[PDB]
Write a protein that binds this ligand. Structure first.
Ligand SMILES: Nc1nc2c(ncn2[C@@H]2O[C@H](COP(=O)(O)OP(=O)(O)O)[C@@H](O)[C@H]2O)c(=O)[nH]1
Ligand SMILES: O=S(=O)(Nc1nc2cccc(Cl)c2s1)c1cccc(O)c1
Ligand SMILES: [Mg+2]
Length: 170
């Protein structure tokens, strides 16, 4: 009695993809994690009374031309789209990840959660209002997280599970 979910964490270099994933799985904050390391992690959790097996891919390279990137966008079921709230360029990158995923899936129906990470940092450059409006225009949830303090990390991944589960009934 268990259901599987394939999750993929994308976003620009340095936004905190690795830090978020490692906090969820190992309960510690990594400060200098080699930015080229790309690994998958499995974790079993209970969400809404369902025992779920999460298979999570922490992506390293974000290159436009990559056969392996095309393969994991084909294989993945939901996408954690991450920007850092102190890096406006990373928030502007989001549009390109969403367009890439839609292309590969040939679909509008794509499970996605927008994540504004580094919420612990006081010098914000991306207004929460702007990030909510972008999420609204995509029809997806929006969550701010801190991989440093562990704020809303479980929340972000479990919200993406709930999105996949709902899309399966449509
Ligand atoms: N203050 C703060 N720093 C973070 C947070 N998440 C990641 N970092 C730092 O930002 C840098 C890049 O994080 P990393 O997870 O390796 O980014 P990736 O390239 O997206 O995997 C590292 O020095 C992390 O410790 C956060 O929530 N708060
Ligand atoms: O051989 S893989 O298809 N393994 C994968 N493992 C996982 C785990 C969770 C979600 C997804 Cl999309 C994947 S894809 C692959 C493909 C491309 C890059 C990789 O690091 C791994
Ligand atoms: Mg990384």
């Amino acid at each position: 009695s268990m259901t599987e979910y394939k999750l993929v964490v994308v976003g620009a270099g340095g936004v905190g993809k690795s830090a978020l994933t490692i906090q969820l799985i190992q309960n510690h904050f990594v400060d200098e994690y080699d930015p080229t390391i790309e690994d998958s992690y499995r974790k079993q959790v209970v969400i809404d009374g369902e025992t779920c097996l999460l298979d999570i891919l922490d992506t390293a390279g974000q290159e436009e031309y990559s056969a392996m990137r095309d393969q994991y966008m084909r294989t993945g079921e939901g996408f954690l789209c991450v920007f850092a709230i102190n890096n406006t360029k990373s928030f502007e990158d989001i549009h390109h990840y969403r367009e890439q995923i839609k292309r590969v899936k040939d679909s509008e129906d794509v499970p996605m959660v927008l994540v504004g990470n580094k919420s612990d940092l006081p010098s914000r450059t991306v207004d929460t209002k702007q990030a909510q409006d972008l999420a609204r225009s995509y029809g997806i949830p929006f969550i701010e997280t801190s991989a440093k303090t562990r704020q809303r990390v479980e929340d972000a991944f479990y919200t993406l599970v709930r999105e996949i589960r709902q899309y399966r009934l449509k």
